[PDB]
Amino acid sequence: EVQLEESGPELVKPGASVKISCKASGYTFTDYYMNWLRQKPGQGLEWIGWVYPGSIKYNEKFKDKATLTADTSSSIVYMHLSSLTSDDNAVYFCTRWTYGSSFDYWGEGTLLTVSSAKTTPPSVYPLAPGSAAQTNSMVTLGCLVKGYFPEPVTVTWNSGSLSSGVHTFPAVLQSDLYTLSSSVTVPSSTWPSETVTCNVAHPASSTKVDKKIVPR
Amino acid sequence: DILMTQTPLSLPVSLGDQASISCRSSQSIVHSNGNTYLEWYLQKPGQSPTLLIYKVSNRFSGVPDRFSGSGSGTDFTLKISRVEAEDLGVYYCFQGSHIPLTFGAGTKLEVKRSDAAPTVSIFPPSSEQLTSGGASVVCFLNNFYPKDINVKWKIDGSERQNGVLNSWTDQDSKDSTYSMSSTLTLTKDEYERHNSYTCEATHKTSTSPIVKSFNRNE
């Protein structure tokens, strides 16, 4: 099996520099070039440059940011990015290449986050309705998870038991920290009667919180 | 730099009907060796792209025959003759003929389905939050289609633009609907100066804007 395996995600501070690896296995390393590409969220792909013993070419645009190096004796390539700002937050991919063969095998991608934030546990707030819901046959409840760093946070409801009717929304950044929320819809017959509880785990800060949603 | 323009940037389709993505280069992509290095990739969410077609019209091994590519000069097409669940994702075209190598913006393929009006809920801030001097008002607009939606907030009858954070889910896998979360963040003092909080959505399913409100006395 042809396989490209990249290093794990990276969290660094602005102005720092990072090294990512792409390890090749399943084929003769020196027959193919390695290209490095970037994908900013919701955006297209951009080409950084290629590494090959014999040829190292950069996209003009990245030629001060990036340094590409190969170690053919362990068939692994490296991309070094420096003076990082948060505009460098992206998923970085390596692929294998020749003019004739195209990008046929890819690495799984490496995530880079550049931020000055320190680890910070979420506050979790319960979102119960104020009474225009009491009447209805379905009721929507919520959980607001905010001011945390870094991603990810896991949210669940009744420890996993409630899976349908759940929406958990992508975290957004504001003031260097994240905020996310999750709704659950349950039949009015079963709340408050039965317990609905929001469970949040933030492994980076080693925190778990359970909040039961109670009427106001 | 050769620019690659894909159109459309989004394309709703029903399973089993037939799609076409156009992709157009800002200059000829014939390489000096004579070959045209135009390619098409498919990326499913949180995955590496995956090669479909190369040299304009050659299918990469494993790729079903429902995919097919064509064009010349600066003008190319990818055609899916019968769309399937596993074909939904983002399609990029790519040019390998001129350095720097470049991609198009992408063309997102989504399942078409029938118009659904959002269920809207508004939630005042929890007393817990208040006691630490913040106030977030949260609005969920759930299970609607299509994605085009405008939310706007009013505090005391008046539009409010700053302090709003909006988040969208992807197209749900079971029912093909979208969902959205809007949050207005205020300081406690600020929240206590005002009385009426409105979350107002405009969506094609309703002539009237869909409105939820509450008053800070209730």
XYZ file of C-alpha atoms in Angstrom:
434
model
C 0.000 0.000 0.000
C 1.151 3.466 -1.088
C 0.771 5.676 1.987
C 1.715 9.231 3.006
C 1.563 9.997 6.703
C 1.802 13.490 8.111
C 2.544 14.726 11.583
C -0.180 15.651 14.123
C -1.830 19.009 14.588
C 0.093 22.051 15.734
C -0.671 24.845 18.064
C 1.931 27.609 18.121
C 2.215 31.288 19.026
C 2.508 34.194 16.563
C 6.035 34.777 15.251
C 7.000 31.220 16.076
C 7.899 28.593 13.452
C 6.685 25.006 12.869
C 8.038 21.853 11.135
C 5.735 19.296 9.502
C 6.610 15.984 8.183
C 5.271 13.781 5.513
C 6.541 10.199 5.598
C 6.304 8.115 2.370
C 5.965 4.359 2.251
C 4.838 1.743 -0.342
C 6.897 2.847 -3.290
C 10.356 4.039 -4.436
C 10.691 7.408 -2.719
C 13.067 8.910 -5.287
C 10.803 8.288 -8.285
C 8.140 10.814 -7.178
C 8.113 14.434 -6.196
C 6.382 15.630 -3.111
C 4.268 18.739 -3.250
C 3.026 20.738 -0.314
C -0.315 22.486 -0.473
C -2.446 24.577 1.819
C -6.184 24.873 2.360
C -7.622 27.766 4.310
C -11.162 27.061 5.625
C -13.960 27.464 3.145
C -11.254 28.195 0.526
C -9.466 26.504 -2.353
C -6.094 24.860 -2.362
C -2.846 26.715 -2.905
C 0.440 25.217 -3.917
C 3.447 25.914 -1.684
C 6.195 24.098 -3.608
C 7.728 20.730 -4.217
C 10.591 18.755 -2.721
C 12.590 16.229 -4.635
C 16.308 15.392 -4.277
C 17.539 17.327 -7.247
C 14.733 19.880 -7.332
C 13.256 22.128 -4.607
C 10.922 24.744 -6.045
C 8.766 27.269 -4.141
C 5.718 29.238 -5.086
C 7.033 32.795 -5.271
C 4.370 33.757 -2.735
C 5.685 31.422 -0.030
C 9.394 31.617 -0.644
C 10.162 33.602 2.555
C 7.645 31.669 4.707
C 8.521 28.049 3.762
C 11.607 25.840 3.608
C 11.305 22.373 2.144
C 13.798 19.630 2.953
C 14.012 15.911 2.200
C 15.713 13.021 4.031
C 15.828 10.323 1.281
C 17.621 7.903 3.630
C 14.312 7.629 5.673
C 12.067 8.706 2.766
C 10.430 11.551 4.701
C 10.007 15.235 3.652
C 9.670 18.335 5.834
C 8.031 21.706 5.480
C 9.255 24.518 7.751
C 6.987 27.555 8.076
C 8.143 30.632 9.948
C 7.133 33.981 11.416
C 3.679 32.570 11.628
C 0.608 34.654 11.983
C -2.900 33.495 12.305
C -3.411 34.068 8.597
C -1.372 30.871 8.250
C -4.139 28.849 10.012
C -4.932 26.142 7.511
C -4.823 22.471 6.798
C -1.534 21.497 5.132
C -1.421 18.563 2.718
C 1.374 16.633 1.030
C 0.862 14.673 -2.192
C 2.952 12.594 -4.454
C 3.592 13.714 -8.044
C 5.064 13.646 -11.547
C 3.849 15.614 -14.638
C 2.625 12.218 -15.949
C 0.926 10.780 -12.790
C -0.728 13.828 -11.048
C -1.637 13.995 -7.355
C -2.699 10.351 -6.863
C -1.964 9.822 -3.151
C -2.312 12.397 -0.431
C -1.448 12.748 3.218
C -4.313 13.033 5.701
C -3.602 16.722 6.270
C -1.994 18.592 9.130
C -3.849 21.288 11.040
C -2.108 24.454 12.138
C -3.464 26.926 14.656
C -1.476 30.074 15.450
C -2.742 31.889 18.567
C -1.559 33.653 21.703
C -4.412 32.314 23.841
C -3.609 30.113 26.849
C -5.590 26.983 27.721
C -8.899 28.190 29.117
C -11.792 26.019 30.173
C -15.288 26.672 28.839
C -18.115 28.171 30.744
C -21.209 26.176 30.088
C -24.594 27.819 30.297
C -27.977 26.127 30.055
C -30.558 27.537 27.648
C -34.060 26.902 28.954
C -36.975 28.705 27.484
C -38.857 31.537 29.352
C -42.525 30.183 28.596
C -43.837 30.725 24.913
C -42.668 26.945 24.626
C -44.711 25.314 27.588
C -47.807 25.211 25.140
C -46.027 23.320 22.231
C -45.658 19.556 21.633
C -41.894 19.739 20.944
C -39.532 21.924 23.036
C -36.071 23.114 22.085
C -33.413 23.317 24.705
C -29.863 24.527 24.489
C -26.357 24.510 25.818
C -23.965 27.438 25.338
C -20.327 26.597 25.624
C -18.143 29.656 25.709
C -14.827 31.342 26.120
C -12.667 28.231 25.629
C -9.222 27.451 24.104
C -8.185 25.472 22.201
C -10.522 23.343 20.130
C -12.054 20.840 20.440
C -14.847 20.504 22.968
C -17.214 17.472 23.009
C -20.875 18.106 23.745
C -23.434 15.400 24.269
C -26.791 15.075 25.829
C -27.890 12.613 28.499
C -24.420 10.977 28.179
C -25.166 9.916 24.491
C -28.734 8.666 25.097
C -30.254 11.599 23.163
C -28.827 11.580 19.645
C -31.716 12.494 17.435
C -32.899 16.086 17.327
C -29.378 17.338 18.272
C -27.604 20.116 16.373
C -24.128 21.072 17.505
C -22.750 24.135 15.773
C -19.170 24.942 14.723
C -17.140 27.080 17.087
C -16.488 30.649 16.144
C -13.542 32.745 17.304
C -14.026 36.006 19.111
C -11.436 37.771 21.183
C -9.074 34.786 20.703
C -11.446 32.299 22.340
C -14.154 29.966 21.088
C -17.914 29.769 21.573
C -20.200 26.987 20.430
C -23.678 25.872 21.117
C -25.914 22.876 20.789
C -29.645 22.464 20.584
C -31.804 19.526 21.401
C -35.439 19.073 20.559
C -37.464 16.788 22.819
C -41.156 16.065 23.177
C -42.891 18.320 25.687
C -44.228 15.217 27.359
C -40.684 14.356 28.525
C -39.405 17.708 29.852
C -39.241 18.805 32.661
C -40.813 15.503 33.652
C -37.613 13.662 32.639
C -34.064 14.911 32.981
C -32.216 16.479 30.048
C -28.639 17.105 30.718
C -25.875 18.718 28.719
C -22.360 17.200 29.037
C -19.269 19.101 27.947
C -15.737 17.736 27.968
C -12.725 19.920 27.109
C -9.787 17.621 27.085
C -7.107 20.347 26.755
C -8.088 21.777 30.177
C -9.094 18.371 31.559
C -12.576 19.581 32.345
C -15.960 17.969 32.313
C -19.137 19.788 33.181
C -22.662 18.421 33.409
C -25.537 20.912 33.402
C -29.129 19.893 33.719
C -31.581 22.112 31.855
C -34.239 23.308 34.288
C -37.169 25.661 33.753
C -36.840 29.291 34.781
C -0.590 33.052 -12.564
C -3.231 31.154 -14.431
C -6.566 31.792 -12.762
C -9.041 28.913 -12.804
C -12.690 29.987 -12.667
C -15.213 27.314 -11.844
C -18.970 27.935 -12.304
C -21.267 27.417 -10.571
C -19.726 27.761 -7.087
C -22.716 25.757 -5.754
C -24.954 23.195 -7.467
C -28.032 21.595 -5.962
C -28.971 18.243 -7.519
C -31.284 15.268 -6.934
C -29.846 11.833 -6.645
C -29.700 10.224 -10.112
C -29.921 13.300 -12.238
C -26.909 14.743 -14.069
C -24.485 17.527 -13.209
C -22.032 19.746 -15.071
C -19.226 21.845 -13.731
C -17.513 24.302 -15.993
C -13.942 25.363 -15.364
C -12.197 28.059 -17.309
C -8.494 29.105 -17.375
C -7.270 32.707 -17.626
C -4.814 31.718 -20.363
C -3.877 28.653 -22.433
C -2.833 25.616 -20.348
C -1.113 23.663 -23.111
C 2.314 22.837 -21.677
C 5.334 23.233 -24.044
C 5.499 19.459 -24.325
C 2.078 19.694 -26.010
C 0.051 17.948 -23.260
C -2.754 19.726 -21.370
C -2.422 19.123 -17.615
C -5.960 19.774 -16.485
C -7.261 17.721 -13.606
C -10.361 17.324 -11.405
C -10.396 16.484 -7.720
C -13.210 15.621 -5.300
C -12.895 16.505 -1.596
C -15.432 15.152 0.914
C -15.512 17.029 4.265
C -12.492 16.505 6.536
C -10.669 14.426 3.917
C -7.899 14.708 1.391
C -8.867 15.497 -2.135
C -9.003 12.599 -4.437
C -7.999 12.518 -8.101
C -10.752 11.864 -10.614
C -9.667 12.941 -14.061
C -6.293 13.891 -15.511
C -5.045 15.157 -18.876
C -8.538 16.601 -19.473
C -10.476 13.414 -19.992
C -8.693 10.388 -18.571
C -10.379 8.676 -15.621
C -8.115 7.678 -12.807
C -8.291 4.012 -11.858
C -11.196 3.169 -9.521
C -13.203 6.149 -10.757
C -16.675 5.127 -12.015
C -17.504 5.739 -15.667
C -20.381 8.137 -14.759
C -17.661 10.796 -14.441
C -16.270 12.224 -17.678
C -14.174 15.304 -18.599
C -13.775 17.381 -21.739
C -12.657 20.709 -23.267
C -9.673 22.413 -24.859
C -7.894 25.707 -24.926
C -9.109 27.511 -21.823
C -12.486 25.901 -21.394
C -13.247 22.582 -19.716
C -16.142 20.574 -18.358
C -16.693 17.784 -15.832
C -19.920 15.831 -16.255
C -21.524 13.419 -13.831
C -24.125 11.471 -15.809
C -25.923 10.067 -12.774
C -25.363 11.613 -9.312
C -24.978 9.297 -6.297
C -24.828 9.837 -2.511
C -21.022 9.271 -2.523
C -20.504 12.005 -5.187
C -21.531 14.901 -2.912
C -18.550 17.065 -1.909
C -16.429 19.777 -3.442
C -15.041 19.639 -6.940
C -11.851 21.512 -7.855
C -10.275 21.777 -11.242
C -6.528 22.120 -11.464
C -3.851 23.290 -13.876
C -0.359 21.716 -13.845
C 0.944 23.296 -17.046
C 2.315 26.642 -15.765
C 4.157 27.391 -12.541
C 2.799 28.232 -10.005
C 0.363 25.332 -10.103
C -3.191 26.505 -9.351
C -6.695 25.361 -8.427
C -10.145 26.775 -8.905
C -12.228 27.992 -5.921
C -14.356 24.900 -5.776
C -17.889 23.914 -6.681
C -20.012 22.488 -3.842
C -22.519 19.804 -4.847
C -25.570 19.554 -2.488
C -28.692 17.344 -2.369
C -31.754 19.233 -3.570
C -34.913 18.740 -1.490
C -38.125 20.558 -0.735
C -38.338 23.951 0.829
C -38.556 23.819 4.628
C -39.287 26.819 6.888
C -37.030 27.176 9.928
C -38.063 26.563 13.451
C -36.841 29.553 15.366
C -36.180 29.678 19.137
C -34.867 32.559 21.163
C -33.217 32.187 24.578
C -32.511 34.899 27.041
C -29.313 34.779 28.989
C -29.146 32.353 31.853
C -29.029 33.900 35.298
C -25.776 32.007 35.673
C -24.147 34.016 32.899
C -25.540 37.231 34.237
C -23.921 36.754 37.568
C -20.513 36.896 35.854
C -21.339 40.176 33.976
C -21.987 38.886 30.449
C -25.246 38.441 28.552
C -25.636 36.274 25.375
C -28.926 36.107 23.608
C -29.062 32.958 21.453
C -31.259 32.294 18.484
C -31.542 28.898 16.741
C -32.947 28.699 13.253
C -33.356 24.973 12.739
C -34.037 22.550 9.848
C -34.686 24.848 6.922
C -34.057 24.652 3.203
C -32.689 26.271 1.111
C -29.624 27.829 2.856
C -30.261 31.376 1.778
C -31.374 33.065 4.963
C -31.088 36.471 6.524
C -31.183 36.957 10.272
C -31.259 40.335 11.829
C -31.506 41.418 15.441
C -33.465 44.250 16.960
C -32.936 45.681 20.437
C -35.849 47.911 21.419
C -37.268 48.048 17.877
C -33.853 48.971 16.372
C -31.446 46.975 14.208
C -28.170 45.946 15.804
C -25.160 44.824 13.811
C -22.115 44.485 16.004
C -21.746 41.788 18.580
C -23.458 39.148 16.449
C -21.848 35.714 15.804
C -23.410 33.306 13.352
C -22.664 29.678 12.784
C -24.010 27.253 10.175
C -24.142 23.532 10.097
C -23.598 21.617 6.900
C -26.368 19.976 5.045
C -27.775 17.377 7.465
C -27.119 13.817 6.282
C -30.518 12.312 7.245
C -32.932 15.109 6.131
C -30.787 17.438 3.898
C -31.748 20.570 5.821
C -29.453 23.326 7.086
C -29.378 24.817 10.549
C -28.062 28.066 12.011
C -27.172 29.630 15.339
C -27.091 33.371 15.941
C -25.718 34.845 19.162
C -25.817 38.410 20.267
C -23.195 39.154 22.905
C -23.647 42.097 25.258
C -22.240 43.257 28.564
C -24.560 42.807 31.520
C -25.020 46.560 31.882
C -25.908 46.830 28.233
C -28.479 44.023 28.428
C -30.149 45.621 31.417
C -30.609 48.946 29.590
C -32.951 47.422 27.001
C -36.181 45.557 27.101
C -37.190 44.003 23.818
C -34.929 41.456 22.014
C -35.967 40.246 18.555
C -34.591 37.582 16.357
C -35.919 38.032 12.834
C -35.374 35.718 9.890
C -36.188 36.193 6.216
C -36.417 33.058 4.142
C -38.286 32.307 0.913
C -40.774 29.992 2.586
C -42.725 32.850 4.161
C -43.961 36.174 2.941
C -43.685 37.565 6.425
C -40.394 37.587 8.235
C -40.292 34.894 10.941
C -39.876 36.646 14.261
C -39.182 35.542 17.826
C -39.023 37.941 20.775
C -39.014 38.352 24.427
C -39.038 41.175 26.919
C -36.502 41.258 29.703
C -39.544 41.453 32.099
C -40.999 37.814 31.746
